[PDB]
Amino acid sequence: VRGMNTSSAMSAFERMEEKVLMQESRAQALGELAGADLETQFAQLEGGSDVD
Amino acid sequence: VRGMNTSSAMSAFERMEEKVLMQESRAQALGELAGADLETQFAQLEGGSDVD
């Protein structure tokens, strides 16, 4: 309850959150870097021209 | 009766009281440290809100 050194629930939460946060943030951040390209924003305008 | 060095009753009482006092006090004291958290006192208010 007080959280001795290897209290299985608390220790597991720590180890999972290390993976969980790093992976998810990497994917969002690298996804925004891959999506940063100006020509891709031009592809949204192109999709507008194409549908019209 | 006068309590010679290893008088079995008196010597046993000493050895038991060493365990008995230490263990029980540890459990009460560590239990008060585990119960010290303010959010647990908020859980009493939460139980009041929940029942009402």
A10 vs B33: CA distance, rounded Å: 18
Spatial distance between the Cα atoms of A42 and A40, rounded to a whole number of angstroms? 5
Nearest CA-CA distance, residue B30 and chain A, Å: 9
Query: Which string of b and e fits B25-47 if b means at least 16 CB within 10 Å?
Result: eeeeeeeeeeeeeeeeeeeeeee
Resolution (A): 6.5
The experimental technique behind this entry is cryo-EM
CA dist., res. B35 & res. B42, Å (int): 12
The Cα B25–Cα B19 span in angstroms is 10
Residues in B touching A2 (Cβ below 8 Å): 30, 33-34
- The answer to whether A1 contacts B34, with C-beta atoms less than 8 Å apart, is yes
